Design a protein around this ligand. Sequence first.
Ligand code: CL
Length: 321
Amino acid sequence: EASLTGAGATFPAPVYAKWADTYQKETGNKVNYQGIGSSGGVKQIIANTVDFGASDAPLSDEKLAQEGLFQFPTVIGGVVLAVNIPGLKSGELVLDGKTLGDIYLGKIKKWDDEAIAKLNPGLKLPSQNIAVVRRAGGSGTSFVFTSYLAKVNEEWKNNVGTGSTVKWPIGLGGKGNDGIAAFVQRLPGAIGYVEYAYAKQNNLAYTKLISADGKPVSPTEENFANAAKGADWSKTFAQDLTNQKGEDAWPITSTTFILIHKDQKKPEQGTEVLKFFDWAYKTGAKQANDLDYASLPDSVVEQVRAAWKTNIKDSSGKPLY
Ligand SMILES: [Cl-]
């Protein structure tokens, strides 16, 4: 029985913890995962203070080669806009990318702005102030959210850009996906972006969004998967799944990565990290699905397995898988 430690992205923490809990019950192995944020996850793996780092934002091939890291995706999730608008139920409100950007730009301050009214003709929107909430530190969720906004709002693109950290025009800072859920839940009129599981598990109302194709879509596990159907994984694991074309493609979709060293100095730990993730691909789909994360296609996991065999070695060049 092994004792493993990972750290990073809170985006997939609900499913990683669930997998960790089950894995221990079935095998005795203990995986301790700390949701500290993608930025921290990256610093820890590079500082070798954990067996595996987790980040929603992918490292480039050059950056991976420079740090001697290997990156592989695990699941597909989606970012949603959780809202606390009194008198509205979950899924009722529809926003489009331009309008979401303008709210984040501080250009739209009330819930009954003409712009929101236009997207929701049948709606009785309150003249409530919009309380924008965003991440306090380095966040992979911020990375995918800002990647999406830059694509749909030119002013955001030109003035704030994309990143795990950006100079937010307005908004209160929340710590972690959990912190944003808690803020929205306590601030009437709040809008915050969270990985879907955090909204559902906290009973937060969320909005629908309009697809790249121009259609209103609801955030569901299937719609997260739809957004990835067109990804050429054979080309690279570092797929941009934001604003993807296709029917029922949730527009703010993203996979998330695990980072491990290619040259394993503690090969026993490395072998065990691999087994845990292999077990998760082999047996963790239902648990990911229960939490509304979509599984990667089998073809991708096979690609990942082949890359493990080729890339992960001990200091004697012996593969660990
Ligand atoms: Cl944060």
